[PDB]
Amino acid sequence: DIQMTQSPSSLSASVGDRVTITCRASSSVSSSYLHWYQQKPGKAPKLLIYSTSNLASGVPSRFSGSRSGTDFTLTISSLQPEDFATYYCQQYSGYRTFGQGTKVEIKRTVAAPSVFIFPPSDSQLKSGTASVVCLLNNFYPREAKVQWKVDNALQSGNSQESVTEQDSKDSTYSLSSTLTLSKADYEKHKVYACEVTHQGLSSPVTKSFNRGE
């Protein structure tokens, strides 16, 4: 079975760059039977180029497709923030095989996060658990340090983090840090704070609330 070897598996580039993604067919493949799809985070793949070199309807002209021998190439001449996606080649010869995929990441200027703090809702408290949520909004790069301090007592091993994919408009990230304790423990202390260190902040930014308004 013909396999498509796609390279690179991922790449980073700035807005306006020219990026190229290559798929090598293990064996012979007709030009009419080689396609390119674009998959944005959480969505289905979208047909990008068909039959090696033909743009699908509603696809900007900065995308182009070409071939040389068994090397098929997808070129984005002027990378845009909305082009953040994974790109797949696909071949047909009765059966179909896809290439492994190429993640395309966008590089941009530093952006400091907007930090918000969310105390547990009385509804959750009645249930026996308390979750405090620290939100870091629209920042870059992804590297960020979030420290949970309950009365300056740095907690460890009791909070989980979650990061979004790059935004399709401004290439930024968002991060949520969830700290979880018991209702009992949540009651035993007063001040709850998260401290954020990020390259966009000259000094760490802390957000807090005193349990009890």
Partner: protein, 220 residues
């Protein structure tokens, strides 16, 4: 106007069977072959097979020919993927896709997630994340919903029945040590609008037939 809609995904026990369906609309159903492509978590696209609705025959990748079968009902404009003897590596998002022209897939469904695990289904609990500012305060306020302790994935979160999309961040679910998933959804709004606009988060967990709408308001 062309659209494909998959359904039937959810939790399957190891060794179990499952029947996915794909409803097609906006074109003449017999004029195009319909295929199934799956994507395992973190991996690439994999072709399963396709069916000719007009003549009834189907073609399969040999690694699925035994286990899976594809059928079609022209009466209902629907294609079906019957899967047997499921295993952990079958956990994936399953898309139906319409073939067109020189064997490209021009239209895809949104996909349906199949989880092959021996655990039990569990609807989520939704809690509000009250706004960071008062109505009379300036600037931007942030608010959200916390969706805790559900299994399996996935849950969909809309805001105000889909009318609010700008500024929404729905985070990837993190698997808690209890084996249950948890995620937050947040949105930033003008704080001044906290007094003239209601904010409701609509959580839907299809595997457990759970639908929850939670208003998020100022605290105390």
């Amino acid at each position: 106007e062309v659209q494909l809609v998959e359904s039937g995904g959810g939790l399957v026990q190891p060794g179990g069977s499952l029947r996915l369906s794909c409803a097609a609309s906006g074109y003449t159903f017999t004029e195009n072959t319909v295929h199934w492509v799956r994507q395992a978590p973190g991996k690439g696209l994999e072709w399963i097979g396709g069916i000719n609705p007009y003549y009834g025959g189907s073609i399969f990748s040999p690694k699925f020919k035994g286990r899976f079968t594809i059928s079609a009902d022209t009466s209902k404009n629907t294609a079906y993927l019957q899967m047997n003897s499921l295993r952990a590596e079958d956990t994936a998002v399953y898309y139906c896709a319409r073939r067109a022209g020189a064997y490209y897939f021009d239209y895809w469904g949104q996909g349906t997630l199949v989880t092959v695990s021996s655990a039990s289904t569990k609807g989520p609990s939704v809690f509000p994340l009250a706004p960071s500012s008062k109505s009379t305060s300036g600037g931007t306020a942030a608010l959200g919903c916390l969706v805790k302790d559900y299994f399996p994935e996935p849950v969909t979160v809309s805001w105000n029945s889909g009318a609010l999309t700008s500024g929404v961040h729905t985070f990837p679910a993190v698997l808690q040590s209890s084996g249950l998933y948890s995620l937050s959804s947040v949105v930033t709004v003008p704080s001044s609008s906290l007094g003239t606009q209601t904010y409701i988060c609509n959580v839907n967990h299809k595997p457990s037939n759970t639908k929850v709408d939670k208003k998020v308001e100022p605290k105390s």
